[model samples]
Structure formats: C-alpha cells, structure tokens
Target: YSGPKLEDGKVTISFMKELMQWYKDQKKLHRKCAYQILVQVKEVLSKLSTLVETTLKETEKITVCGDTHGQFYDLLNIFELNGLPSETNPYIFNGDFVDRGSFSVEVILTLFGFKLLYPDHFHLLRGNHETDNMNQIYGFEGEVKAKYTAQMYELFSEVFEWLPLAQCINGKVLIMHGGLFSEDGVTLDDIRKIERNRQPPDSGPMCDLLWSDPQPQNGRSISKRGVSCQFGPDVTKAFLEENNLDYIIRSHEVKAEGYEVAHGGRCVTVFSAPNYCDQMGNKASYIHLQGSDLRPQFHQFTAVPHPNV
Candidate 1:
C-alpha cells in the first residue's frame, strides 16, 4: 500500500495501513450498504473530534493551502512540490478538504493522520464546504453516495458542526474560510463570538460572519443564502480599517488564477485545486508565512493534464 516519495511529499505507509484498518472495521460493524456509506463519515468524525489547535510557535513556517475540492492526488503533488512538514516548515490547510475530487476518503484520512503524527506542525481550518448543507448540495455529498449512503451523509453533516471557525497567527493575520461584510465590525472577538453550531439566526452578528461575502459594494443588499451577502468596497475598507489588519485571506470562490488580490490588496483569495473540477482551468495557489514579521509569500502550482480539464 506504500507509494514512492514524490519531491518533498511522500504518502506515508503508516497512513495507508491505518486507512485500511479503518475501512475494514467499518465493514465489520455495519451492514454492507451502511458500511459503504458510513465508513468515510465515521473516519472523518472520529478524526475531527480528536483535533485541537496547537499553541503558536516561533520559527514556524506556516504553508497555507486553499480549497482542495477532493483532489487528493494533487494535494500529494503539492506536498511533494512544497517541502513536507518537519521540525521546521509546518503545513496549514485552509479547508474544503473533501468534495469534487474522487479520493476524499483518502484525503481526509491522510491529513488527519498527519495531524496525529505531527499535531503541532499541521493545522486544518473550517471551510464552508466542511458543513453538511454545502456538501449535500455540492459534489462531495455525491462522492459519499458513489462511494458508500444517505445515512452516512447525515453522519458527516453532524460532524462538520464541530470544526474551528478562524485561526490567528502571532496576532497579525486574520484567516478564515470566508470574510465578514463591511457592515460588520471586523475583529477577532466578532468571529469568535459566533456559535459554531448551525447557521446563524437572522438579524444577528453570527449570521453575518458565517454568511457574508466580501464583494465590492457601498451599501450592498443582504443575501438570502444566509451567507453570501453582497458587500461594497467601502465595507472592505472600513472592515480592514476597524480591525487594524494588514490583510485578510479566504477561500469559497474558484478564482481562475487560483489567487486574486482584492479590495485594493486588502483581501486575498487563495485556491489550491488546480484545473478545478477538471473544467475551470484554474491553477492552484497557497500562501506561506515566515517569522514574527509575518512576511507573506505566494506559491503557485500548475494543473496536471487530466482529461476533465
């Protein structure tokens, strides 16, 4: 079950063994039909329940990756291209680890296994797709169907409710799966106050954090999606001004270039799935931060020549 090491990233033999054991256990515990559906769900939840953020460290190089869309192989390629975490350079994945690609089960388990092995060096953020509502509507839920069931899908739906919303690095950069609209005052406490249970209730602050979009508008209208409210450039400007933040990083949008600097360079979008969904023809990109100065660096990877693209 072991594979050759590519560049800097190698698929760990221990991870494959663990995955095989988990799959076998699932098959034994549930009916064949149910096991097929619940195997990945159980594995993801089991691992997610065990996840806790590590204390910030000095000399840590955080490599931030964007929406994976289930392109697990490409992720391996990314690991190969970028040096895998050791005692020095650590890995920070910005979520959307599942869906769209065919190997989500392997992807989730691999990253979780890495976290288990190097808890302090690996960090995974919560993305919008990490929720059941989005996964069911998007391709990942379908991935669950093709691979395993509706019941199994329900299991993951509940599991996503527990993921961490935002990550703060050395108290400088504000990172999350999405950004708050201008109307909402930008602050760490603002996002922290959000109860990460279900969607936020109407006419409240939590709703704005989880559901708001950062599109440019001076007085944009609220969105019906609960998230994705239209925001103006003034909102972005005001938000950055109020928060005292140098930059904001987010996923959620599939940028053709894989990364887009918006709001006059105040906000940046980093997408990690190259040739997204085998159609968008987008290249994948990530951000790397080094030292206390929080020096930001961008890394880009080309899309593989897959037929879908």
Candidate 2:
C-alpha cells in the first residue's frame, strides 16, 4: 500500500553524503592556504561590492565607451581627452575590457582600482567577451595566460557575472554592450531578468542579444555570422517603440571612424580606443552628455603620432 521511492533519489542522497564527507576532510588538509586566498579575494570583492552600491544613486552627465580589448595606453589617453571619472562626469564601460590586445591585466586592474577609489564615478557592464566561451576565442584568455595563470582568468570570470546589465540613463536612453533585442521581448526588464550565470545555447534569443550585429542599410535576412537569427530594421524599430526610449548606445563592433550611428541614426556606437591594435586607422571616440541646457556632444580624437615629452 506504500508508494515506491525512486532509486535515483536514493542514489542522489547517498552521493550528497559522500560529497559532504569528502569536503570536510579536504578542508582540514588545505585550511591554511584556503583561508589566505579567501582573505585576498574578499579584499578585491569588497571594491566591486562598493561600486554596485554607488551606481544606484543619482548622477550627472556621463560619458560611455566600449570594447577596450586590453588597450591600456589608449585607455589612459581616453581619460586624458575626456577627463577623469568624477561625480560631475562618470564613465560607463560596456565590457570587453580584456582579451585580444596586450595589457588586459593592467587594464582590468586599473579599472578595478578606480572603481574602488571612485566608486561613484565608474561603472562596468558585462559583455559577451566576458564569458569563458568568447574569451577563449577572442583575446582576453590569451592575455590572462600571458599576464597570470589560468586561475586569474577564473577570478575575472566570477567578477564579470556580478556586472549590471542594461543601464538606463535618465529613463530615456538604453545602454548595453551589444546590439539587437532578444526574441523574448524588448523591455528593459527582459534584459534585467536575464540570468547572468547562464550561457546561451547554439543560437537563441540570449545569443542574439549578446552577438547580433546591426545592419543599418539592410532589411531582415539570415545573419552572416551563422549564429544569430537575422535581425533587421523592424526589430530595432520594435525595440525602440516598445521600450519608449529615445536612443540606444552600445559598443562592440569597431568602426574606422571610431563610431557609427545605426538604426536611422537612433542608435550610436562609441569606441574609445584610438589607433586600435596599432593599425585599424580608427580614431578613439566618446559621447559627452550635458544637461538639458546643452545638447549631448560626441567627441572624437585621433591617435597621437608621438608622446608629448
């Protein structure tokens, strides 16, 4: 008269008990090293935690850029041209801070230190490259290998998961690291609700949001990347209409001009790395936002031929 218990459940229970015992014994063997590492991790994590709290407060006009790709020299030039992060002027980094180029470790560590010192002025967003899969293919993983051990890559990956997604500016502008809308919806909440820890499948809505490219001139068709479903003009229009936003600002693709305005000029792309990869011939660019008293200005800077001595 009793219901039969599933064998799978009994096996799972036994596995958990064994795992618990193993964990207890392992802790005793490496407790000293484990505690030392934990202390170091907490010091780093505390800096990021403080930044998370600071971004929630109200702020003034901000400048945003994307896809640093470990260009530390260009990053310094950017700060020089655009001014330092402060309460009056903030910097929004839309991910891709590591990989491809050299100096990724310096780039990330500098930003992390800035965030700790001026938590109210700097913000970071998670991008596709922040994930393990993209980093392996792109430049970040290699940079980690060159700078530190594999363990450094794992630590940064954990940091990326905690980054905030889709920051809204003055409830009017939608800011993100990549382009196109997820098939699920166009609302900001959809982006917010996305699970940061979950990786996208082969090709789905999640993948499109992080990987889709904008074709300003072309209509809907198959994607060239053979990954994301084709996203055309209608998709961008629908996203804007649904979100009730004025414009979208994102950075992922590199432009020869340092920036490109797509979606009939409703969306703007800003790349702050001048002389990208020491070639590309692209100038660095950033958007400067002033209050209602003045219109937002997009500033562009060409690479310096030689350092000023």
Candidate 3:
C-alpha cells in the first residue's frame, strides 16, 4: 500500500519509508523533503507546550525509551525488540534524539515521521541537547551544516523549543529527559506554568528538569556537570509525593549496563544508546509498561553495526 498522501498535508508512510531507506543507504535526504519534515514537526510540537503532562490509561501498554543520541540502527533494534509504534504499542522517546552520532537527522526525522503518523501514540520530549548551544558543540549542528544548511538547523531548533518538557504515564510514572528540580518541592502545576518557545535558563526548576541528575544521598548537591544540581532520595520522594507519582524516569547520563534504577527504585535512569560513541562498550535498554499494575519491564540490547560506523 502507498503511504499517506502529500496532498493530504500529512507525511505519508511511503515518504517516510523512502527517507528511512535513504538515510540507511548513507545518502542525504532531499532538501525539500527535509524542510517539509521540519515544518510538520514544528506544527505538531507547537501544540505540546500547553500540555504539561501526557496521561495514559492504566490498561494501556506502552514503551518508554531514553536518549537515542542519533544512533539510528540501535533505535531500529529497539523497535525490533520491543515492537514498532502502533495504537496498541505506543512509544515515548524521552529525549536527546540528536547529537553525538552520525545519523541525528535520520533518527529525529524517523521519530518525527511517526509522530506525524501517530500523534497520540508517539510522544517526544525535550532534552538538554535539544538546545541550540548544545547542538552547536555536538554533532547535530555539524551534521546539519555538512548535509543541509544552517537554516535547516535553525528550523530544528524551533521545533526543539516547542517540545514538551515532561510526560506522565498513567498518572503514575513521571518521565523527563533530566532529573528533578533544584528546589525542595514542586508540583505538576509548576511544570505546567513553565513558558515555552525559549531557551532553557541557566538555573531553575525548568533548567534542572533538563539538566539535573540523582545523587545517592538524601539531599541536593552541585552537579559535576556544573550546569544543574544533583538531587537525592529525599528530593525524589518529595516530588513524587507532591505529584502523586510512583516513579520518575529520566535520561541524560550513560549507565554502563544501559539503565539504572536509583533512589530505591523511585527513579530510573535509562540510556538507550548502546556502545556510546562506539567506544563506551555499554549496552542499551528500553522500558516497557504493561498490565494493570503498570510495572516496568526492561529490555536490554547491545549496539548493532551501522554502515556509517
């Protein structure tokens, strides 16, 4: 069957299939197609700012993935292991879709294609690297500059600014790219009040949500990264209690085993990029949510060889 019709003002599966094949075959996407994809992505993302949290039914089965970091083939491996995005098996990519890999464009575009196809079932959140400053230093700016133009890179930045900062799964699991805030207490309402279409602040709840991490202790401390604070068990507990959430899942750090359960399982750090930068030799993983209990199931896999690598 043919994909969605371009005349319908939607990205068709056939078009996405062609784009995927082009990226996999080590070819750049046509400029027109790339520009169009960015336009569609920006349109969808613009509607997400008012949404502080996305809720799912306790009965729904969904997959939660972490930072892909432009590891395109590894993302395909994730789909192969966990099944593709569908009405039945929805997916939430936590953040950091670009940077540090050879195929940031392919990764982001593929996810954007799915978002266009399944807006409700496919969710994308904002990550620290989604910022223009991070992109400038990371591989995303360089990749887009080399393959496309700096103007295209600007379009991607606009989309990133509109991405939702966090998502709530079944109102039980809290998901974001980074960890908790710098303050002692916060509610979902606080997150809802955060303004959109702006760069992340240097320090604050919004910045911390995109930059912080978890410490083994019971309090907050300065992050070694020097950008955001490192929160501890007490902070996690307070946030969950205030928000009535069971767990907080985030991506930002690379775990040697691909994922780590911290704060006594009250928080989870899942890194989906395997063998990061083709040097870390780490495994990658994605979390599955199923059953009425909404228990988390982890699926781990090693990196696959890519032609570009």
Better of 1 and 3 by TM-score: 3
Winner by lDDT: 3
CA lDDT, every prediction?
0.63, 0.62, 0.85
lDDT of 3 at 166: 89
Q: How big is the RMSD of model 1? A: 6.3
Q: List the residue pairs that clash in candidate 2.
A: 99-139, 99-140, 100-139
lDDT winner, 1 or 2 = 1
| Predicted structure with the largest TM-score when compared to the true one | 3
TM-score of each: 0.75, 0.75, 0.95
lDDT tens string, model 3, 56-174? 66577888899999999898888778776777889989889999998898899889888887888899989999999999999899998888899988988988899999888667888
lDDT of 3 at 46: 85
Off by over 4 Å in 1: 1-13, 16-58, 149-151, 199-211, 217-226, 305-309
Specify the poorest-scoring 10-residue window by lDDT in model 2.
Answer: 1-10
Report the candidate with higher lDDT, 1 versus 3.
3
Q: Arrange candidates, best lDDT first.
A: 3, 1, 2
